[model samples]
Target: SNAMIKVVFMGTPDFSVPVLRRLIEDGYDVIGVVTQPDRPVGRKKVLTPTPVKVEAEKHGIPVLQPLRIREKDEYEKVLALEPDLIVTAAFGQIVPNEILEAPKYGCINVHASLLPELRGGAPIHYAIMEGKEKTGITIMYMVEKLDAGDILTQVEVEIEERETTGSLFDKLSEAGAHLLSKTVPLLIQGKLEPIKQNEEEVTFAYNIKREQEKIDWTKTGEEVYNHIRGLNPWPVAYTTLAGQVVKVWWGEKVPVTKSAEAGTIVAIEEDGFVVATGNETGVKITELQPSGKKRMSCSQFLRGTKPEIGTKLG
Candidate 1:
């Protein structure tokens, strides 16, 4: 029965790669793949394919690159594939209603957060930034409303004490792959039932903006630490020193019994520098990248430029 159900996979980004790979490995009839088009990346702005596209080509599956899937012409190509079921993970587009109802078994999604929580594009980042102790994967049916579909199943994951979004992304990706693998077999056997999400508990993990990446010195040390790592390994948290952008890559909260103006350089140690926070506490910036320079330890950064203890950052 699994072999009889023709599937069309949809996704983009590195997080979506594992889900597609699992489908192919499970011997599902994955007739086609739909992902965002290749885009320019890095300092050179070289065009790069989505990770899903790369995986699809390895299996010689037909890949569709739609600028906007809501458009009739672009969606028509997917309709021609005649898939029995459609599966998506971080596909980065608002799929039209016709495609949602096209598949015989309908459309399912591999969402990164539990239903009714973090129901937007950047859940993994929000879970860490908001200091949530735990988050998980949710496999659910798709509907016209964003992430409001009935829940099919879920798997919970703990947020490590020092977890970064980058680390959590990998954990959830693996969890989703494992969960989807089990869910599909049950669905095909007519053993799975979808449950409605409790609307009262709904929360959103809206996309991160460039302006939000700037460090806010007015928060407590712990909050600052969380914000820094929440964006680490991508679009890192930044502050300004002497009117130049200094991207903070890693930091640790330290107990400071005294008070100073927030963003002031309270102290400089052998390993790192201490910046006072809004709560009269301190965060030791351990790793950072100065503008036009590679990321390095605080000692390495200090070697070239001597920063005064009374200097203030913003």
Candidate 2:
């Protein structure tokens, strides 16, 4: 019965909101919610609460915004709640043994990627960036290290050929919510078996950085394609266009047997334009944003800015 289970829900992102909502929907007593402190976002430094925090307050749940969960003071705040279970999702902090040991059910995490594979802060982004065939959510017990924990269950989703990090992120977030809902009951009933992760098979999904977001025309068309889509819509894959930064939002590979200078405009379409790449390969860019301008289609770009056939880009 939910009476026997008091959950301390811990998460701090949009991905965690649905899981928390589902718990309430299923009649679980999520007694307390913990999230990271509200902070500034973007160039304007606009302050905002996390999506999780916003969800928690809407439901009138008390929240703890500890700067670092591992701090003794912060850790004790979790202990003070006296929860039977601690459910975490992308909490973005290292959970300690104290929090894990405090709960009768220990701690379980709803990880974005299958355990042992892509076991780090940013899984969904890397899964698409690396062009994996599939990636998914894993419900597992929490350990001191990153995602080196035991698996309770998982649900896989295929990576579509033209998928971007944004698309894959939404898919994984929704899938993770369902997995958490299914597993929580089994966990409370003491019927779920935790399986240890395979250390030898481990891989990582480290956070993306701006330097790595640069588009290198020297790379193959497929590599460039994946890189661009992987960083789309934020810290976007960027290159120099007519001596200014241009962000590519959408494109596809076009195989070319003939050679041209890589990074040079080779062909133009009424709707878009093709740029040469390594190994006589190329990419057809449909969407882009010149520095300090709104994103526009290559057709719209051509209407105002005529980049000639041999114009070099980076």
Candidate 3:
């Protein structure tokens, strides 16, 4: 407990909470915590600390909430910590060469997806949308480039058929913490060898945008299903119903033997309404939220509007 491999933790958002907390709970010497600056949230737009900042303070750890972590001053502050290793998880800022080279064992990032694939800000979210059967976390050595680093180790988790980004985020968070517990020590002990990532296998998971969340009914049922699930619970997937925007929170894939135009409501029931897809399959929306209204189940939305069958929805 005296001086066993001091670690500097860097993170932002809930995805990084487990690893930051894990370092403390596991009794590592965490010398400093660097997280993103607090920002406004919610309808009222109240200023709020990041999930990482909230946890770091609860542990009585020194915190650095810098607006531009790539700046010279912030790098110097981190370098001054004299940590053995710098561990990052969902830390928004790119690590500059100054701080990356300062740590005794170098900076190791706990990334949400396997390296060379989904190597950007929104990996977990894109994995589900892309219909991946599995996604994993990689503990990689930090480099100047974005997630184009040598792999220290990796841990995989099976993607649930209907997994949302929210659920997958929690799963990967815990998995990353577990992986770090096993790997960081090996790294410091110099027992593990770093493996180069295959550049040819590289594919990026670019950040999701407002336009990307709009449901494209012309897609196959499974594709539509994956989009809804991938964006679930945040920047939710949506479509226009009778020109009114409706956010889809939950859905189920259904086979459609009968043909209906894409976006046409094929079936409406107490449980849900089936909307046709280009592939002759349809998805039943279980839950959704109309613009400026509270979220409701299909039954509730139906209660509000008894739309005729074959009505085209966006």
Instruction: Choose the strongest candidate by TM-score.
Output: 3
| Global fold similarity of model 3 (TM-score) | 0.96
Query: What lDDT would each prediction earn against the true structure?
Result: 0.90, 0.85, 0.89
For candidate 3, which ten residues in a row score worst on lDDT? 1-10
Error of 2 at 264 (Å): 2.1
| Clashing pairs counted in every model | 0, 0, 0
Residue 267 CA displacement from its true place in model 1, Å: 1.7
How many backbone overlaps does candidate 1 show?
0
Residue pairs with colliding backbones in model 3 are: none
TM-score of 2: 0.94
lDDT winner between candidates 1 and 3: 1
Clashes of 2: 0
The sequence of per-residue lDDT tens digits that candidate 1 reaches over residues 67-100 is: 9999999998989999999999988898999899
Per-residue accuracy of model 3 over 101-127 as CA lDDT, tens digit each: 888888999999988889998899889
lDDT of 2 by residue, 1-314 (tens): 36567889999878899888888777778889999888888779988988989998898999999889888999898898899999998788878789998999889999988778998877877877787889999999888877888899899999888888888878888888888888888887879988999999999888777777788898888888888888876658888888999988888788765688789888887878889998656898889988999889988998888788889897
What candidate 1 gets wrong by more than 4 Å, as runs, is: none
